[PDB]
Amino acid sequence: RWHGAGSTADFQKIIQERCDTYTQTIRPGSRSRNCQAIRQAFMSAFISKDPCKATKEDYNSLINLAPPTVPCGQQVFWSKTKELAHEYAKRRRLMTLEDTLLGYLADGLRWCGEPGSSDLNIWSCPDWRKDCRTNYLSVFWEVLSERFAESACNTVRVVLNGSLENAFDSMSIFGRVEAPNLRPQVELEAWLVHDTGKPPSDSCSGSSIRKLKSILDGRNVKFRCMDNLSRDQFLQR
């Protein structure tokens, strides 16, 4: 029925198993959380509904069970730097969205339902461009991203791509949802990191980063920007 790839096979089992692994072996001691209840809430958010009428409100109950809150001074944002940013966060024992409970559950997966049915659509799912932006996969990442940004505290870091013409993309989730909802008075450190021995194409003094700085000034968030670093110099530091 849709243009996008279908749901991850065995979605329900994958998320519950990821939840067990996360809560018991990845970030334990926190107060306890029921993984069966989390799985049930996640399914209830989208199953049997119109797959192109997802709203942020559909996810309030799921997120309340496990908000994407990272301890102060440990939070990492990224944009166009997925691989690098996660390497960095892993090495420094920091957390990206994909390191929160719900982000860990959902990372890399696909899901959508079908009206009337209680089952996943494993055959096809709304593509964001061809079908609808208001789909359950896209909306999940948006609302999770917003709460993650709102809960950030003290010093936060962002890894950006110094090999693009514009390291800051105002239409990205980081630019649209995260930066504009950053808790006021936190401090943000940006790292603009470039490839290989390929000379950077954007810097902290470029137009796009000046736009980011304007947003942060508006949030009363202090900004420090470092650039002209290759992947190795950034990670080795």
Author numbering: 41 to 277
Q: Would you copy out the relevant sentences from the publication that reported this structure?
A:
Altogether CD38 appears to be a key player in the biosynthesis of calcium messengers which are involved in a wide range of cellular functions. Thus, the catalytic transformation of NAD+ involves the formation, via a ribooxocarbenium ion-like transition state, of a unique reaction intermediate that partitions between several competing pathways such as an irreversible hydrolytic process leading to ADP-ribose and a reversible minor pathway that governs the formation of cADPR. α-Helices are found mainly in the N-terminal and membrane-proximal domain of this transmembrane protein, whereas β-sheets are preponderant in the distal C-terminal domain. The active site of bCD38 consists in a funnel-shaped cavity with a fairly rigid structure; it buries the NMN+ moiety of the substrate and its scissile bond in its deepest non-polar and least solvent accessible region, whereas the AMP moiety interacts with its more solvent-exposed region, at the entrance of the catalytic cleft.
In agreement with observations on hCD38, incubation of crystals of wt bCD38 with rFNAD and aFNAD resulted in stable covalent intermediates whose structures could be resolved at high resolution. In both complexes, residue Glu218 was found covalently linked to the anomeric carbon C1′ of the fluorinated-ribose ring in an axial (α-anomeric) configuration. Thus, although both copies of the enzyme contains a covalent adduct formed by reaction between the carboxylate of Glu218 and the C1′ of the N-ribose of rFNAD, the conformation of the covalently bound intermediates are quite different. In one copy of the enzyme (chain B), we were able to model the complete ADP-2′-deoxy-2′-fluororibosyl moiety in a folded conformation with the adenine ring stacked at full occupancy against Trp181. In the second copy of the enzyme (chain A), we were only able to model the 2′-deoxy-2′-fluororibose-diphosphate moiety of the covalently bound adduct. When the complete ligand could be observed it was found to adopt a ‘folded’ conformation. In contrast to the more extended conformation observed in the Michaelis complex with rFNAD where the adenine ring stacked against Trp168 (see above), through rotations around its C4′–C5′ and C5′–O5′ bonds the adenosine moiety has flipped over and the adenine ring is now stacked against residue Trp181, a position close to that previously occupied by the nicotinamide ring in the active site in the non-covalent Michaelis complex.
